[PDB]
Symmetry: D2
Subunit: 374 residues, 4 copies
Amino acid sequence: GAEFTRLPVSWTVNPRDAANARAAWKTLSAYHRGKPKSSRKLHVVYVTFKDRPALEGYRERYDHILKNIQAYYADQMQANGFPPLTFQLDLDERGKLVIHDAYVDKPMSEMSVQSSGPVSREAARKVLASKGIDIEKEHVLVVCQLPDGVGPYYGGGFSHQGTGWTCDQEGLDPASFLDTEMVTRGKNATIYIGGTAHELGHSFGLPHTGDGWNYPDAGASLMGHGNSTYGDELRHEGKGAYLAPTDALKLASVPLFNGVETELPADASFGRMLGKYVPGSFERLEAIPVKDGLRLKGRVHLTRPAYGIVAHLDPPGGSDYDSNAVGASLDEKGEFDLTICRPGYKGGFIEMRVAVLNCDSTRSMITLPVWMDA
Amino acid sequence: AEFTRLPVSWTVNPRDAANARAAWKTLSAYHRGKPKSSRKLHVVYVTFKDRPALEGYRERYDHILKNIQAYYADQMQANGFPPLTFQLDLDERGKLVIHDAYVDKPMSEMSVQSSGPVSREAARKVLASKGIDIEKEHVLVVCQLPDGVGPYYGGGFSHQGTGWTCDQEGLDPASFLDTEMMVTRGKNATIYIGGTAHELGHSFGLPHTGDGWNYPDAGASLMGHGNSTYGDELRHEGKGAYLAPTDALKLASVPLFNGVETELPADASFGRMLGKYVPGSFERLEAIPVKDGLRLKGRVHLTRPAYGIVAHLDPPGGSDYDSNAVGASLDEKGEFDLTICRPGYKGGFIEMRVAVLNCDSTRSMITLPVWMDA
Amino acid sequence: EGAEFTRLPVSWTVNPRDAANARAAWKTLSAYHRGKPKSSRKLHVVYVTFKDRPALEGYRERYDHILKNIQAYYADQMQANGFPPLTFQLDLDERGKLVIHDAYVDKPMSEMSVQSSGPVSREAARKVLASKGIDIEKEHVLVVCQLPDGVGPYYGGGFSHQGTGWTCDQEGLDPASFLDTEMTRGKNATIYIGGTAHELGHSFGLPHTGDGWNYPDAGASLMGHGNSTYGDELRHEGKGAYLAPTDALKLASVPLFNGVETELPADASFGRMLGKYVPGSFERLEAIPVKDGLRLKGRVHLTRPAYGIVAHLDPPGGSDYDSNAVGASLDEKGEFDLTICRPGYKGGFIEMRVAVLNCDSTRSMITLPVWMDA
Amino acid sequence: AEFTRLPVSWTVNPRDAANARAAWKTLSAYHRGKPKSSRKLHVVYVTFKDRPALEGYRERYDHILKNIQAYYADQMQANGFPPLTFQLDLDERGKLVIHDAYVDKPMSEMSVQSSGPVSREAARKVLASKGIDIEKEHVLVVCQLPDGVGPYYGGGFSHQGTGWTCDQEGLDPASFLDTEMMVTRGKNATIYIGGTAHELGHSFGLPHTGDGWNYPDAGASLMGHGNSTYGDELRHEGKGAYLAPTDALKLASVPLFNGVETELPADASFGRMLGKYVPGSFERLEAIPVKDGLRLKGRVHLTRPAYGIVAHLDPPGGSDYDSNAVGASLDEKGEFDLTICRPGYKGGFIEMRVAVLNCDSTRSMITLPVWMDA
Ligand SMILES: [Ca+2]
Ligand SMILES: [Ca+2]
Ligand SMILES: [Ca+2]
Ligand SMILES: [Ca+2]
Ligand code: NA
Ligand code: NA
Ligand code: NA
Ligand code: NA
Ligand code: NA
Ligand code: NA
Ligand code: NA
Ligand code: NA
Ligand code: NA
Ligand code: NA
Ligand code: NA
Ligand code: NA
Ligand SMILES: [Zn+2]
Ligand SMILES: [Zn+2]
Ligand SMILES: [Zn+2]
Ligand SMILES: [Zn+2]
């Protein structure tokens, strides 16, 4: 992996999470029996503008960037107990990343942070459509040749479609992760390449999941603030970013990751959190208090095959960045049993989200208002 | 007997009477030292340009209002509370005071959509002339309008509400005994006076509560379809309308009923169901399945003094008319334990609403999606 | 022709402005369809029997008549509106007769309810259709149930690219009965076959559109209360059911109707009304009062190709059954100009919905609160 | 001068002053015959187990509260209104009355999530000791807590509100002049006292209103980011903070400011923006595009007396901090005419909020999606 500065795995999964991943993968693998295989890829578009020509080495640099994130997701999913699942890239005969070029005949003065997303997305749609790729049904990364004050840094999508936006900078490459010269030059690469890994997670349907007591020496959760520590373990003794078991549970049912072209149900709907959702119900639901935590057990009514369940604790304020999450697998009857803790929590009230993970890639969510103390 | 006082045609289950006594003890402790209320249910009679008042309306609605007043008093007592009910504004002869309001529009200039707002505005002006603010009181607005033009509606909460009805020739609770045909004349009075008693319940903040397995021989729940059986026990062979124990629990914290002028909290807000609501939370919540039922137990976190909790089971479709409810009291720590059943239910999915009753007249509600079978 | 399935006549004449709108909308849609794949979609039919509920006699021939009657109706009504005779295609065998998939549910009627018959029959339809390679989650389907009233489902729900309609069979139900004045009854056949045509409109994404001043002698709008007058002509002074021009405009972008397999955008989302929606905006928007009406003109900002616009006037109460609608086409710049009236309206307040019709089958909707008088 | 009174460092545009004069004439007629208000903004100082009161807090917060009081008065007057501001509870010496409350919890048992509710509960009990109901008054809760634990928040509406802030050693408006470092001491005092003035605006029901093209040399709008420039004149660092004309219009109907005890209507409800709202409707509404702007004119249907109207332009993202607003008065028929601009805007889509200001202190709001260019 050294050619694209492959990141190491700087954490060890808890045995309960590894057992959850193996059971979820067994349930998903049975569901995948007999279904068509997926040929989906994460496509990359580079968008230039009238006074904004392409930056040097962008084809080689983004071959390194995408392959670094690709290997990262692969290595992190494996560290969680899944196979090394990750998105595939469109590669040329030499194994280098295919990059679609798009140009927008507008000067930067006619652009804004509000319009750079839609304008670059339309440009990406046109060039991708010319090669038979529908941006409305695929996962795409849109790279903009724009500066921070105008260009977009955003990610949004779900299991069957998503778009991520980023901006290129001169010499941006994962090889800079080791450079401690000059705010440092590794931290700069950490911010933007880690941000892209984070925004791509959103395009796969992942919300925010912050750090939790069960992983104090694992680095920062990628979907929390791990976008600021991605690859920082290669300099100055840092802890890096790890993919939370709950996020690995969610990605396991994404066709782009599991290589199986499952079909979405007609009632799959957007919700307040990222992803697509369907109605669910409980035959049994129990929230039992413990010291600085909660034991959540019950029985999901299986209207459809489902493989797992994810509980989030979310203090009021600060969006979902300060949340922590715990995963669990569902047996053949839909029963689950997990404990989620917040040691030393003094906020009293806290929001609990409960998300059932369906094999058809949708989710079912309920929200419960909980009081927690010692 | 002068206003044809209705009998009490049902017996409360012992557990519900014990809940009412425990709830009344909690409310009485909360009421210690608070100012007493002088609130009344005010009555306005609205005429229109070509629509003069019907004969005997002052005597007839003196009978109607005292009949509904005595019913609520008798039903609250049958539930285990004191005979709580709304007070009336009476003149020196002990007769109901009725404010006359006039709308300078012919009946042809009216509609079912505008009759409500227009008559309410006319009621505001006449009530303001006597120093009574319609925006902070409970009022019954009687319109001299025929069916299909006039309003029959009720809406409000614990500290304000308005009920709308239309007068008809000879409408009097004495007609409950009349078996002559006009639908007989007793059934007609049952429909209209029962509708007023039902819609007045809405003005107090009550949603719909249909009939339940725990009361098969009590008549029809007033807030279900008991508006069509109110007072029908006085003829033929009918079971009348009874005030559901869960509705009695909610009304006990209404100042108009308990005679105590408590203050509403600043965050009291309207919701999907009638009434005003504030946030709540649970320290423990358990929904345990039983045959054709569910046991709901847990511990409410008491951010404020609270006296009871009401669970509703509501099959999809048909609004909340087909719901059934079970009440329970809260101890000093917020603990509750109830069981709610739906015998023979084959619908599978059923909605469960859980409403904590706060002493400050607000409620805290959650909704859970539940699967139920045998 | 069409006498074999008792083809209905066209008992109304479109207003010239609406036919001109339809032609402009079809020109815009036709340009958008250039180069897009052709559609092979069909309206599939499933017949579900139960343990003590065997199939009724002649159901294969009767529903060949029923489905072909509704098919010819939509074709004739779309043509009467100024479009080509657009309609759904059916799956026919070598003899040209309707294909009906047989499904059996091994459950007695005592194991059914009005809440579960819908979902249970859908699951049975899913299993049998999958056996023939038909995914119920990506097609329009009619599920015919061998269940009686009060237990069986009568429902329609869906959008442009998927939908399901539910109905129940009754002995001898056939469109030939439209002429029968005995008692079977003609009104009986009108109600059930008209309900199916109406509910199929829901499955295509249509909400309710009641009758309007601009069509007083056209019969009852199918999506209003026309389900109760469908085919009531050919029986004495009946005026039938007509397809509102606004409903014809909406169906013209449905692949099942226009035969073009357009792709839905990723952000297509469900809303408060039936159909799928995307964000939109206006460059200019003017609501000018007229006597008992409103002039609505402006300029839609074209984020995507759009062909038409539909305005709804909806008095409060009574759901959207009492609404009236007016259509208008969009020029190449997004300009529109329409007038919508409600003569003699006395409600004062009225809700106005404005829905831009996109060529990709989605819509964009805003709601405005309007006061209207003479 | 004793409390370092701020100057007026901006001049209102003539059209806005005429709007204020017209709005105040309309409000004054509505106030005729209504009872006078004796409301005051009460101040509570909350200490904790290991957090004793800081030195001189009574004199320092007498200076802080009178400074904000004089600020609102001078700014309301500079806007064209009378010098409206909140009244304070003063002792015999004319010094601010500060209620002392104690929380029996060490700082280690506190958090940013609980500091608000816990200190609010402590303030409720002590204010109740003097007959002041926190649920029906405006209160400022000053906490003896450090940053990261203590609360800085404001929330409320016209008839009730609560502001939260934290005390710091030596915090006094006299520090506005100090240019020594701590990052200077005037900037520190500006942030904390400006935050309090800003959060108190939220407690009065004001959302965010950022800066606009019509006031480029007036400083920063208080309800935008003016909390960070409050008092910047007194040390020649910048132009300070000014009260936007749209905010002055909203505050003019607040009893705490106008001294008239008007009654809130029963249907006053919270919404997505701060304040309480009632339904409204338009007889005419026109949004006419101009170069880099929009002309908004029409006729509000007056269901109740209304005095003004406020338009917000809000680009997507960044919350409402980057919005700009324009005010306009309503004549006796509800007619209004304003123009709101965003020069050089390149984002295309922009959100427009339209808020009718009712004399009973509530508002009526609609939201329109607008496309804007040159
Ligand atoms: Ca949070
Ligand atoms: Ca129901
Ligand atoms: Ca309606
Ligand atoms: Ca914004
Ligand atoms: Na390691
Ligand atoms: Na640059
Ligand atoms: Na570093
Ligand atoms: Na970034
Ligand atoms: Na009459
Ligand atoms: Na009877
Ligand atoms: Na059991
Ligand atoms: Na019949
Ligand atoms: Na007939
Ligand atoms: Na959706
Ligand atoms: Na919508
Ligand atoms: Na601050
Ligand atoms: Zn993020
Ligand atoms: Zn009702
Ligand atoms: Zn319908
Ligand atoms: Zn703020």
